[model samples]
Target: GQYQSPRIIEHPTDLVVKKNEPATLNCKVEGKPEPTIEWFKDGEPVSTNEKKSHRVQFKDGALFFYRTMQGKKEQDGGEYWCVAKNRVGQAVSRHASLQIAVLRDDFRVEPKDTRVAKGETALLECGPPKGIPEPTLIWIKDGVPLDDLKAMSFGASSRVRIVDGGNLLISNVEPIDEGNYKCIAQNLVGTRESSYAKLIVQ
Candidate 1:
């Protein structure tokens, strides 16, 4: 019987992390009879229980690091490898050392609360200081999803507009639209929710 090794079908080559913060990496492998996973840093086996160094943790075939210092560790900026082995063959996942950088100032929404009159339109804007990966913007009313909202307009009337620049426009406000509205901005790092704005229709 021949041993088949695991193969890495899809893996990320580069990962991003913030300076002085923890770094995390995940590798997905495919093989026969389930493969054993091992991680290496700077051509050396990674040890998890060593108190003097950062610890390695695994969850669902994904590797995670507790805490890592970039400049302090000489091998910090080195090649990291993930090796998977099984009965058939061996496969390796290659990843380069991550250069930690400070995160830019986060953008937020101001004047969170606003009032509007019936048959009037309201515009709210939310913007980050910078947009790296495109952000997903979602509008919620009374803690309910508003993305699937449909507006029946008479003669091309504009009822709602949601834009990526962090703007939510509501035209011809109605009493049904009167509620607590919140805008949620989401990215790879995490999600941020703005203060609630009560839309009062007169």
Candidate 2:
């Protein structure tokens, strides 16, 4: 076979991790001669001298993070890449991004209860006080899942919709819309259910 230069066959994809949690990025390569792999952060070579190196280790074409010390700070997020080099030549893999998420201790929903008259609009807000990796918000009504609620005929009349920032917006609310509403926040760490908020439409 003809001699071939180092080529990256597989590279790590973007990743989002919880604060202080362990993470890993992998890179695979092929070439005539075994290629050496190096990890980089934001175009700079990663070395043991940096503070992050205390928890960072590179081996077998993979970068491992024992634990992030920064705990989801801005500095903890950045572009990362893997470089492969051999006697013939070198190749740099496409940049991958690393994001750190922090789940706030005060994660909860605002306004434990909201009352709206028939034909009125209502908004129920929920979110984590602070979170990384962006938590997913889900709305549940009267113990029924959102999907099931949407399937019901009244769903359209209720005009139920999830708006920006995980808020539940109900337009033209009717007496049937009155029920127990719940907001759920989810992420890698775990799931949190907000206190049930009663929506009374009269």
Candidate 3:
């Protein structure tokens, strides 16, 4: 019987995984008889070492990742493709990009302590750390999370607001509004708190 060359029936898709999370990369093929499947990362063959925990025979046509680390995860995350070969010929699938989400510990522009007269406007500015998935920015005032926001949100009144990516604005401020403040950068991978800055009411 004449056998047909291997042809890819299914290919892996782009994936963004969090640190320490598991991932499954899939590849399926069709051919006469059966095709032997192999995996590659950025064009290099993926080898499995059980004791080293580098890679293992998770399945005949799949790649499994148990944990995604910080620095080490970047090594494991990259362009991946699948190869299938049979007596007739070969088949190669389209590439799939793998990325790991991350959030840094430090802020790009940490907020500074500021003083303002009572009944005057107070402005607190901050910049969140760079992240893979663009960490969400939220302000914390007096240990309260002001995260429910769009461009300008939080405080529940006209007197306070947060705008322009983690900056806090308070108009006609009162003594009750003065307190310690910081920005929180959060994403799927990690959470970070910026340096604390105090607001002094004069």
* Candidate that scores best on lDDT: 3
Q: 33-53, model 3: which lDDT tens digit per residue?
A: 688888898878887545665
Error of 3 at 10 (Å): 1.8
What is the RMSD of candidate 2? 4.8
lDDT, candidate 1, 1-202, per-residue tens? 4445688865546666654567766778877778888878777887654666665656445656555555534334446768888877788886756544432346655426778889888876666434334557777778776765553333433467776567788888778778887777665545667777887888
Per-model TM values vs. the true structure? 0.50, 0.63, 0.67
lDDT (C-alpha, whole model) for all candidates: 0.66, 0.76, 0.79
Q: Candidate 2, 82: how far from true, in Å?
A: 4.8
User: How many clashing pairs per prediction, in order?
Assistant: 7, 2, 0
**lDDT score for residue 94 of model 1:** 69
- List runs of model 1 lying over 4 Å from the truth: 1-13, 16-20, 23-106, 128-131, 151-158
Candidate 2 stretches with Cα past 4 Å from truth are: 1-17, 26-38, 49-52, 58-62, 69-76, 82-105, 118-120, 127-134, 154-158, 187-189
- Candidate 2 positional error at 162, Å: 3.2
User: Best-fitting candidate, measured by TM-score?
Assistant: 3
